[PDB]
Each structure stands twice: as structure tokens, then as C-alpha cells.
């Protein structure tokens, strides 16, 4: 693989006590603690940009203003594909020596700084090379370091004209050096469509490579592909989590909706996954009637539709975001019917915990049986298979995965029984609600009372909302 960033071990910086967060060329930093993201970007500027090193470090630049500690930010680089990667050649041409033949792939770039009290100016002492144990003397011919011929920081901070012309300027002038775009909040004066355009040029075109993107709007993350997403936790003590966000060719067709839905959820402290928009309407009504500040204390309703949760689960778990999923046990037929049914409702929850896909179970449904009787038989079979796999359901509850008894609507009817009958005035309100999920769900929500909302919220079969709200 081409040359890629690997890790940065920021220690005793303005806010970073001791963090070793992985990197990979295309980087995205977001989340809480805007000062944390700003400090991370300025740490990269200190490690790579000469325009920031010359000012040195101050008393405030250290962690808790404690001048005793030493700033040590160590960028880690991975080198491979020497004969075809131009940037690898750019990095290894300037470095003369200090590269042990044992490990020609790893390359450290550290930055040691100790504060002196006789002058109140912490000197930036670059010490880069290939091994942490042994460092040779850096040339440092005056103000320009040897690193200055390799890594030049192009700082973008607000105007689409500048973004459009930086491509031309770098292509025609900065070919020799490696460009590292440290973009900090480019959504300041860009429209939603402008944010989409900038995301398309960033995450798809090769003109922006090795870029560190700071964003606060989900629109800038609509085209994420093989990047490294970095999320800063909400605590004042900065904790950052990293995840390779790459879409498989299986999800390539649905990549647009996948990214559009996941980008908004990336900024939520707690994310709840749902299948259909009727579930969205019901959960939104319940939350608005019990806790309208769910979006405030950290919450989201991620509508995934079909596909699988595997990509969503990996992305949400790697960033450390609270993981909540409520799903419906659905038995879908495939190829020849009448005895062939998959277990997507359960096959998913198995795939989230790994294991293996269940075989296509066979249900003996007579041909003459149809309509209400067929649905009753399917519900009985779903109840039987749910009662059979009690251990798997227990593991899902232990791993914050919620699976319905048969379907979501049956759980809703169990939580509130008389309210459904009063609203729909039918002997079988569940069947009527399944007849047209959207319109009937809207009608149910419009006539849904606050007491009914509280009963739904406090029921154990709807514990997803309780987990989303939190303490």
C-alpha cells in the first residue's frame, strides 16, 4: 500500500495528557471539545509547519500550565511501495541516514520540548528518524529544518474560490513537497450544497490527500470512503477514538444513503438504529412526549432501512459512541417460496455478534391458508424461534441489542392494549396498522396520549428509548 500516516502520540500538549490515536492520510476530527480539535490541529501544525514552530511554546501550551512536563508529539509514518509512491520518495530522499535496515517501513517524527525558567521560552527540539531508541543529529540549517523540504502545511480556515484554486496552486507549484491540508471548520461560510461539493472534492478526488478535516456539520461527511474518522469524547479530559471508514463493494451501490444517514449519527453521543420511518414517527412522538431534550443530552434516530448493521455497528463501536439497536424479527422468503424463509431479524443480530448465519428454516404453510391465518402461523413460528433462542436474546440484552418478540407493532400492542383499540376501533388493530404502516402509524401518533406515551416508554419491550434517554 502507498505511504500512509499511522499514529500520533501526543503527550502533555495543551489538553492532551497522553493519547496515541491512529491516523491515515484522509482524516476527519469532530465531536465535543472544539478546543480539543483546535489543539489537535495546532499540534499537527507544530509538528509539520514551520510557520508555527518559530513562535515556540508558551506557558499555556502545556497541560494544566505545568511547565515541569515535556511536550512529546510523535508522528508515525508507514512506508511501502517505494518504486511507485512519489510521496515515499519525497520523504526518503531528504532523510539521509537514521533509517535502520531492519525496519524500513516505520518512520517516527517526534517533537521534544522542555521549558526553561531562565528565559520562559520552551524550545521546540525536533527529533525525527526511524527508531525511538536512537536518533542522529538533525541538520537544521538555520530556520528551515530538513523536514521543511518534505511536509508543508496548507492551513485552510475561512469562500469556495480558495478551495478551488488551492488545487491548481498545489499542482503547479507544490509538486515537490508533500501537501498536508489542515482544514479547520470549512463550514463557516459554505452552504449545504457547498459543503456537499467540498466533501465530494475532498473524499473522492485525489487532489486533497493527507488532509486533516475538522467539521461540526454532518453535511461535510456525505462522501466518506477509506478515511480515518476521529471522535473526541465529551469529557473535559480529551479522549479520541479512531476508525477506518471504508465501504465494501457490497455496500457501494447504497453508499450514498449509507453515508447520508451515518454522517448525522456520527455527531450523536447515543445512536439508536431503526428500520422503517413508521418506527421513526412512533419513537419521535414518544420521546417528544417524555423527553424532548433527547437530541440535547445526546440522541439520534438512525434510519438504516435494509442492508445490515455490521458497518453501522463497527463504525459506532470503534468511535466509542453508545450503541443502541431496536430491530424487528422478519422472515423473508427467497427464490422458490412455500418452505424457504430467511431469518434477517435474527440473522442480523447474530452477525452483529459474529457467529454464523442461520440456515434457511422451513415453515410448512399450506397453500389454501392465506391472509389472516398465514400471518398467525408466521407469528406463531416467530414466537417459537424467539423462545427457542433464549441464550442469544440474553446476549443481545447484555450487548445492548434489542430484538422484538415477533415484531415492533406486537410489542407496541403489548405495551398499550386498550389505547390501540380505542384509537383504531378494530378487533385486530395490529393487522390494520400493518396494512398501511405509514398512514396508520401517523393516525396512531396523532391520537396518541401522554399517558400512553409514558406507558410505552416505561415498558420493558421498548427499553431502547429508556437506554437512549439515559439517566
Amino acid at each position: 500500500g502507498p505511504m500512509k500516516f499511522s499514529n500520533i502520540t501526543i503527550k502533555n500538549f495543551r489538553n492532551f495528557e497522553k493519547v496515541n490515536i491512529n491516523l491515515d492520510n484522509k482524516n476527519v476530527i469532530f465531536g465535543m471539545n472544539d478546543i480539543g480539535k483546535t489543539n489537535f490541529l495546532y499540534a499537527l501544525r507544530f509538528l509539520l509547519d514551520k510557520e508555527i514552530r518559530k513562535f515556540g511554546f508558551n506557558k499555556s501550551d502545556y497541560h494544566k500550565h505545568d511547565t515541569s512536563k515535556k511536550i512529546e508529539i510523535i508522528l508515525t509514518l508507514d512506508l511501502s511501495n517505494y518504486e511507485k509512491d512519489e510521496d515515499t520518495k519525497k520523504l526518503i530522499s531528504v532523510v539521509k541516514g537514521a533509517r535502520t535496515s531492519a525496519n524500513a517501513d516505520v518512520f517516527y517524527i517526534a517533537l521534544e520540548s522542555k521549558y526553561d525558567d531562565k528565559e520562559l521560552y520552551g524550545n521546540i527540539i525536533l527529533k525525527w528518524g526511524s527508531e525511538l531508541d536512537n536518533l542522529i543529529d538533525i541538520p537544521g540549517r538555520g530556520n528551515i529544518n530538513a523536514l521543511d523540504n518534505v511536509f508543508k502545511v496548507i492551513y485552510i480556515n475561512p469562500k469556495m474560490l480558495s478551495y478551488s484554486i488551492y488545487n491548481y496552486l498545489a499542482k503547479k507549484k507544490y509538486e515537490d513537497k508533500i501537501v498536508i491540508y489542515l482544514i479547520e471548520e470549512p463550514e463557516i461560510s459554505l452552504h449545504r450544497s457547498m459543503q456537499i461539493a467540498l466533501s465530494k472534492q475532498l473524499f473522492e478526488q485525489s487532489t486533497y490527500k493527507y488532509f486533516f478535516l475538522s467539521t461540526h456539520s454532518p453535511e461535510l461527511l456525505y462522501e466518506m470512503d477509506n478515511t480515518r474518522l476521529i471522535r473526541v469524547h465529551s469529557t473535559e479530559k480529551v479522549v479520541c477514538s479512531s476508525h477506518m471508514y471504508n465501504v465494501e463493494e457490497a455496500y457501494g451501490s447504497v453508499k450514498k444513503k449509507l453515508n447520508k444517514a451515518l454522517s448525522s449519527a456520527l455527531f450523536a453521543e447515543r445512536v439508536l438504529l431503526i428500520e422503517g420511518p413508521s418506527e421513526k414517527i412512533l419513537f419521535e412522538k414518544v420521546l417528544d412526549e417524555v423527553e424532548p431534550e433527547y437530541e440535547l443530552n445526546g440522541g439520534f434516530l438512525l434510519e438504516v432501512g435494509g442492508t445490515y448493521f455490521n458497518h453501522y455497528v463497527c463504525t459506532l463501536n470503534d468511535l466509542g459512541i453508545t450503541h443502541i439497536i431496536k430491530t424487528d424479527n422478519d422472515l423473508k422468503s427467497k427464490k422458490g417460496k412455500k418452505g424457504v424463509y430467511e431469518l434477517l431479524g435474527l440473522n442480523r443480530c447474530l452477525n452483529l455478534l459474529g457467529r454464523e448465519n442461520l440456515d434457511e428454516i422451513t415453515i410448512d404453510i399450506p397453500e389454501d391458508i392465506k391472509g389472516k391465518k398465514k400471518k398467525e402461523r408466521l407469528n406463531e413460528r416467530k414466537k417459537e424461534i424467539f423462545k427457542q433462542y433464549k441464550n442469544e436474546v440474553g446476549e443481545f440484552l447484555g450487548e445492548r441489542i434489542y430484538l422484538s418478540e415477533i415484531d415492533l407493532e406486537n410489542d407496541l400492542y403489548s405495551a398499550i392494549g386498550e389505547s390501540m383499540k380505542r384509537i383504531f376501533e378494530n378487533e385486530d388493530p395490529v393487522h390494520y396498522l400493518q396494512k398501511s404502516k405509514l398512514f396508520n402509524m401517523v393516525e396512531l401518533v396523532n391520537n396518541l396520549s401522554t399517558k400512553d406515551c409514558f406507558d410505552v416508554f416505561e415498558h420493558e419491550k421498548f427499553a431502547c428509548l429508556k437506554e437512549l434517554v439515559g439517566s
Binding site: Y82, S101, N149, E175, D176
Partner: protein
């Protein structure tokens, strides 16, 4: 017109120049043209025994941000290939900084030279005036170190070689190793009539063979 042939260049270029210098102006023109048309991080290396030639080359050329090396072959090697990578190739025990004195050892066996270099830090030459041990050491350090090969590949895309008739088999092997095993372009100019340093150790017969037997290096005639 030979000026058009000089401008059009193309890959490796061999020019049969005359005496009374002459090679200096075409060397300067080629260096300037290569620096001008280039738009990447690739550097250039021009090497010449004559120290005042290096001084005038540096004087008539401007300051370059990218490192361009002007010096002598032995100085070139001992500066960038031996000095940095001697510890990496042969362990931390080998010294990194040293001075070259040809009239210290005067040995007869290669093994004895190896022992005295390893232990007593002394670096000299063979009793035989032919051949230079420095280029053999450069070959040895290049062969068993991938870092040195990568650095030489990435740094210089075309190495300029001057007064190649003075070259013996050792730096000939070094230059061919850089050209073939490293796919690095070479710009070599030499005078067939300048075979006067034979007693010093020069054996141009390999250069004449490359003129005749080799086909990659096109031959050019300069008036």
C-alpha cells in the same frame, strides 16, 4: 546544427568532446536545462575531480532549495553513502566520522586491509596503484542495505559524471550498479584522447567498450 541536438537531449547522453575544456559549458547547460524542466523533488549529482571546477560550477549556479551535490567522487561517496549508513549497514560498532589518508596502510592482502580498517580505524589504499577501495566499500554498503539503495533511488534521478576516462573498474561498477540495479539515469561525458592518468589508476578500456559494445548510450559528436 548541434545546438538542436543538445537541447533535444533524451535519456542517457554521451558526447565525444574535444580537449581545451569545452565539456564545462555543455555540462553547465545540461545541468541548468535539467533543473529548469524538472518540476519534482528529484535532485541532481555532478561530480568532478578538479576542485576549482567544482568551485566555479557552484559560483556560476544559483542557490537551490533542493539539495544538489557538487564535489569529487571520493568526497561524494564518503559524504553521502559511507558517512550516514556505515552504522546502519555494518552495525553501531563501525565509526561514522573519519578522514581519508591514502599513504597510511599500504597493504597487500584484502583481509589485512579489512582487519586494519575494522580495528585501527585507519583507511588507506592498496599497494597496487590501480583500483580504489572506497568504491568497493560503496558497493558493499549498497548491496546489503535497502535504506541506502532507496535513498540513492529517490534523491537523484540523473547523476552527472565528468572526466570518465579517469574512472577505474570500481567506480565504473558503482555507476553501472546505480544505472541498472537502481534504474537511475546517467549523464556521462568523456574524452578518448584524455588517457593520460593511466599511471594514476585509470583504465578507460571499459569506457571504450561501453562506447562500442553497449547500445543504450547513444554516441554524439560535438564540433
Amino acid at each position: 546544427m548541434s545546438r538542436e541536438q543538445i537541447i533535444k537531449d533524451g535519456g542517457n547522453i554521451l558526447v565525444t568532446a574535444g580537449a581545451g575544456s569545452g565539456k564545462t559549458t555543455i555540462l553547465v547547460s545540461k545541468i541548468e536545462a535539467d533543473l529548469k524542466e524538472n518540476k519534482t523533488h528529484y535532485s541532481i549529482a555532478a561530480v568532478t575531480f578538479t576542485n576549482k571546477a567544482a568551485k566555479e560550477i557552484e559560483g556560476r549556479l544559483g542557490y537551490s532549495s533542493r539539495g544538489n551535490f557538487i564535489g569529487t567522487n571520493d568526497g561524494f561517496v564518503e559524504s553521502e553513502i559511507i558517512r550516514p549508513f556505515i552504522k546502519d549497514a555494518f552495525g553501531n560498532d563501525y565509526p561514522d566520522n573519519f578522514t581519508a589518508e591514502y599513504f597510511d596502510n599500504q597493504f597487500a592482502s584484502y583481509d589485512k586491509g579489512l582487519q586494519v580498517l575494522k580495528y585501527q580505524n585507519i583507511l588507506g589504499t592498496y599497494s597496487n596503484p590501480k583500483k580504489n577501495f572506497k568504491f568497493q566499500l560503496a558497493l558493499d554498503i549498497l548491496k546489503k542495505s535497502l535504506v541506502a539503495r532507496q535513498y540513492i533511488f529517490s534523491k537523484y534521478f540523473k547523476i552527472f559524471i565528468d572526466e570518465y576516462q579517469d574512472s577505474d573498474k570500481d567506480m565504473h561498477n558503482l555507476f553501472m550498479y546505480l544505472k541498472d540495479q537502481l534504474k537511475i539515469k546517467l549523464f556521462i561525458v568523456g574524452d578518448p584522447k584524455q588517457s593520460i592518468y593511466i599511471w594514476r589508476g585509470a583504465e578507460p578500456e571499459n569506457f571504450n567498450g561501453l562506447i562500442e559494445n553497449s547500445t543504450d548510450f547513444n554516441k554524439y559528436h560535438l564540433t
